[PDB]
Structures are given as C-alpha cells and as structure tokens.
Design a protein around this ligand. Structure first.
Ligand SMILES: Cc1cc2nc3c(=O)[nH]c(=O)nc-3n(C[C@H](O)[C@H](O)[C@H](O)COP(=O)(O)OP(=O)(O)OC[C@H]3O[C@@H](n4cnc5c(N)ncnc54)[C@H](O)[C@@H]3O)c2cc1C
Ligand SMILES: C[n+]1nn(-c2ccc(-c3nc(CCc4ccccc4)cs3)c(OCCN3CCNC3=O)c2)cc1CCCCN
Length: 489
C-alpha cells in the first residue's frame, strides 16, 4: 500500500548513503530520496554527491600521493641507468590539482547519470533535517530559519552525513587549513606545517613533501611522543625514521599556542617550547567528529552520545525504530568500505527481510604514507591484555632493488601477532611498498581464522616482499599474562 511519498529518505549521498539508496531502489524496487548539499565537489561545502572519499577523501588523496611518489621514483631511476637533469626538478602543483579536479568531476557526473537513469531513486539538493520520525526537511542552508525547499514524507530515515574536521580552538585557528582546503590550494606551499599525528596528517605531509618548491620543507608537529596512535609500535618508529630520510621534520610533544598573519601573507606560529616559526600554510589534521549538529536530532528524539555520534545497535538502528544511521556519523570505524557494508546490511535487514549486522573485527586498512602501511587485526599491546599467551613474529628486510636505487632507508617490515595456544593470527602489521595491496588478501585469511602454520606451509612467490609472510616460523618474543618475556615458561 501507498501511505507516504518515499519508503526511504537518505541524508548524505556518501559511501554509506548511495550504497543504501541504490540497493533499496534497484534490487528491492523501493522509492528512495537521497539528500546532499551540492552535486559537484568544491568549497565552501567541499563534500558533494559521492561523499567525503570521492570528493575530499581517499580518491583525491590517493591521486596526490601517487603524484608525490614520482619524486622518490625519479631519484631511484638513476641507479638503474636513467640519466636526466635532476638539478632543481620540482613538480607543477596546478597540473596535479587540474588533473585531480577533472577525475573527481567525472565521478560526480557519473553519479548524476545514475540518478537521472535509475527508476524510484531521486536526488534532493540542500540541507536535510528531521521534523519527526516520518518527515525530513531540505533547506537552502544549514541555518534552521532558511527557506524550506522540500518536505519528504517517508517510512524509513537513514542518517549517513559522515564527519567533519575538528579545529584547534586557539588565537589564530582561522588562519589554518584542513584536508578540505588542502585539496583546492592555488600553489604548493614552500614552508608547510602539518599539525596532527593521524593517517591524514602523515599522508598530507608526504604529498606536500613531494610537491614542495625547490627550497621548501614540510614539518609534521604532533602533541604526543610517537605518531599513529593505535598502530604497531615498531611500524610507527620505522615510519618516523623513513619520513625523516625522505626530508620531513617530525616534531613530537609540540602543539601550536598562537598563529598570527605576516605582512607577506605567511603565518607566524608560536609553540609550547617557546619556539616561533613562519609557514606559508598550516594544516590541522587533529580529529574528525560526526556531522549530527544541524540535523535537529533532538526534535525527532534520536539518541546522541560521544562527540555527537548517533547511537545504533548491531543493525545500525537508532532509539527511533524507523530511523537508522551508518558510517562516520555513528563513530565506530571511519572507513569507506565499512560504511558501504553497513549500508548494504541496513537494506538486507529492513527491505531484504534477511537480517545482518556488519562485522567490525579483523577489518584491514592502509595508510598511504610514503612508504605505506597495511594493517589487519590487533597490536601486540591489546593482544597481550585480552589473551593468556601471545607470540610475536617479526621480520625487517631491504628489497635488493634498493642496493641499486640508493634508497637504503626503505626497510620492508612484517610483524605477526599470534595466540600461542592455538597459533591463531590476531594481527598482521606491514610497512613498505605494496603493503596496502598485500594486506587485503591477508584480511581474507584472518576472516577464515588463519593460524601461523597456514602462513609458513604456503609455498612462496619469488621474488616478492609478500613471500616473507610465509617464512616466519620462530617467534621473536612472547607475552604471558600481559608481560613481555624473552622465552616461554
Ligand atoms: C582526507 C581523507 C582521506 C581518507 N582516506 C580514506 C581511505 O584511504 N580509505 C578509507 O577507507 N577511508 C578514508 N577516509 C574516510 C572516508 O572518507 C569516510 O570514512 C567515508 O567517506 C564515510 O562515508 P559516510 O557515508 O559515512 O559519509 P560521507 O561519505 O562523508 O557522506 C556525507 C555526505 O553527506 C553530505 N551531508 C552532510 N551533512 C548533510 C546534511 N545535513 N544534509 C544533507 N547532506 C549532508 C555531505 O556533504 C557528504 O556528501 C578518508 C577521509 C578523509 C577526510
Ligand atoms: C542507465 N543506468 N546507468 N546507471 C549507473 C550510473 C553510474 C554508476 C556509478 N558510477 C561510479 C563512479 C565511477 C567512475 C570511474 C571513473 C571515472 C568516472 C566515474 C560509481 S557507481 C552506476 O553504478 C551503480 C552501482 N552502485 C552505485 C552506488 N553503490 C553501488 O553499488 C550506475 C544506472 C542505470 C539504470 C539502473 C536500472 C534501474 N532502472
């Protein structure tokens, strides 16, 4: 029967939202409205049709990291006989941004063709907010007194509005940029400060390092002792070293207290230690918080916790039974394939009749640092707490090509965290070229409950960095009852 205009209204046409909207509309023939604030990428809104990863996230970030890598690859070609004038060779940033804009734009265009050509799936441009459990309002602006454009009468509501960069909140915070503005910079900065120690700060440090003009430099300033909290300790220390050798100055236990604007348009930065310094740009990558604050969630009575995160059960359902929330807005794991999986599971549950909850354990991820990280499962620190007896397997080697390339700092590192009792693999931590590609396949094995014996019984593929996975038999050391031991009782 027809009660309402739509079966489903989706707030946010991102990784989660479009998966949900598309699945609900084509495989279940439901009537689906999808709300987003613009159709094409660009400031001041930044995010658009396709969401954060397509417009100002992993797609454009990966293109720019690929771009930055050519600095290393061009240097390394010399050893192999490639002679070119490397005297003051630095790249054209405008070329990169033009090329990246062209690619993202063509994805935005591809999503418009999807909407126009897909029956029962419609796109509603503006700002979503709830009036009640069955009514979503689309406005011209975020401001709740702005003109109402549409009133969407709907059975189910899916909240998939993702996240937004946190600010520093100090005098001169407004002279700083984020990931959002970094993507639309008119020029590659000569003197770059990346504030933060998360995967975004580190990935962007490597981009600015690759595209810096000829006398330029990148500083990475983190308020803690060691970058990349939540990652393997030895991977974090080895990457810190390898950023150093690539020319990035990593500064620990440091936070800006004050930014002021210089005469020439640069930024004077004061720090904890008393130090003052000038940077052409200062970028903040210090957190991303749910975008729940303009959705009028209290009006409809949807439970908000954490940093404005929407509370859900294993089925991504809110306090209101017809309203669901997925992706970065629910906190949990802020990854694109997770949001897509929750979106898929939401449609299977509510419209498919076949209930499913997204499995958030043993999810592999990557950091597109130079060099990159590939990780799946737990650190030895959290293994040694939750587990009786833990074996740590560890191997570091230098691909022979780096004897020729000159890049002798490029240690490839594998670390396997195991349960000593049954040999079950709890964690795999890799640092080096192709780690993100290798870890995907490792994620499959770990899903199937792979044991260390499954790794070293596999015939190697020679020569690769990945064959070292299948040559780790003897533990480096153990933990019994959460304490590190040389050898086992
Ligand atoms: C720089 C960067 C790099 C990243 N790299 C990776 C990576 O390599 N791998 C990875 O897995 N993840 C990566 N991520 C994370 C990834 O982008 C997110 O986890 C993912 O986009 C979350 O999808 P979502 O559906 O939850 O929300 P989003 O994709 O953010 O969807 C939100 C959408 O809703 C819109 N919207 C917001 N508020 C409203 C409103 N009130 N009304 C209507 N529409 C609204 C937004 O404009 C946006 O289009 C990266 C993130 C950043 C910032
Ligand atoms: C004629 N027609 N064209 N489309 C269409 C259009 C676009 C897409 C997509 N484009 C992209 C971007 C890919 C891209 C890659 C390189 C350059 C540019 C874009 C991802 S999904 C697309 O993919 C749908 C799969 N999706 C989308 C979101 N989640 C999914 O699983 C489909 C649909 C239809 C009718 C459907 C049947 C019901 N009447």
């Amino acid at each position: 029967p027809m009660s309402r205009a739509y079966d489903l209204v989706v707030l946010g046409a991102g990784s989660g939202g479009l998966e949900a909207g598309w699945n609900a509309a084509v495989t279940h023939k439901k009537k689906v409205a999808v709300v987003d604030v613009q159709a094409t990428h660009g400031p001041p809104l930044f995010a658009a049709l396709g969401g954060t990863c397509v417009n100002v996230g992993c797609v454009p970030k990966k293109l720019m990291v690929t771009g930055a890598q050519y600095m290393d690859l061009i240097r390394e070609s010399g050893g192999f006989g490639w002679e070119m004038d490397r005297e003051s060779l630095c790249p054209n940033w405008k070329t990169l941004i033009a090329a990246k804009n062209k690619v993202v734009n063509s994805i935005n265009e591809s999503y418009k063709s999807m909407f126009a050509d897909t029956e029962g799936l419609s796109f509603h441009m503006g700002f979503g907010a709830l009036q009640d459990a069955h009514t979503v309002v689309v406005r011209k602006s975020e401001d709740p007194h702005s003109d109402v454009l549409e009133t969407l009468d709907t059975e189910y509501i899916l909240i998939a509005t993702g996240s937004w960069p946190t600010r520093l909140g100090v005098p001169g915070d407004e002279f700083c940029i984020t990931s959002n503005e970094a993507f639309y910079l008119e020029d590659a900065p000569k003197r770059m400060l990346c504030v933060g120690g998360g995967y975004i700060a580190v990935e962007f440090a490597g981009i600015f390092n690759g595209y810096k003009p000829c006398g330029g430099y990148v500083d990475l300033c983190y308020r803690g002792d060691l970058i990349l909290r939540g990652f393997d300790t030895e991977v974090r220390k080895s990457l810190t070293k390898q950023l150093g050798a690539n020319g990035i100055r990593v500064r620990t236990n440091l936070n800006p207290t004050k930014i002021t604007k210089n005469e020439d348009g640069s930024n004077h930065v004061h720090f904890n230690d008393g130090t003052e310094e000038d940077y052409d740009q200062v970028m903040l990558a210090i957190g991303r918080v749910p975008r729940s604050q303009a959705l009028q969630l209290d009006k409809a009575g949807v439970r908000t916790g954490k940093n404005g995160a929407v509370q859900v059960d294993a089925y991504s359902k809110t306090s209101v039974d017809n309203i669901y929330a997925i992706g970065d807005v629910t906190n949990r794991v802020m990854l694109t394939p997770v949001a897509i999986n929750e979106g898929a599971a939401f449609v299977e549950t509510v419209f498919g009749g076949k209930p499913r909850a997204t499995d958030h354990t043993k999810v592999a991820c990557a950091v597109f640092s130079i060099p990159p990280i590939g990780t799946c499962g737990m650190t030895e620190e959290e293994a040694a707490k939750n587990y009786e007896t833990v074996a740590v397997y560890a191997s570091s080697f230098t691909p022979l090509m780096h004897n020729i390339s000159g890049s002798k700092h490029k240690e490839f590192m594998i670390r396997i965290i195991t349960n000593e009792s049954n040999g079950e693999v709890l964690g795999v931590h890799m640092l080096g070229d192709s780690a993100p590609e290798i870890i995907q396949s490792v994620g499959i094995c770990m899903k199937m409950g792979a044991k260390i014996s499954d790794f070293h019984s596999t015939i190697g593929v020679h020569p690769t960095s990945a064959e070292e996975l299948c040559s780790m038999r003897t533990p480096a050391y153990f933990y019994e009852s959460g304490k590190r031991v040389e050898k086992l009782s």
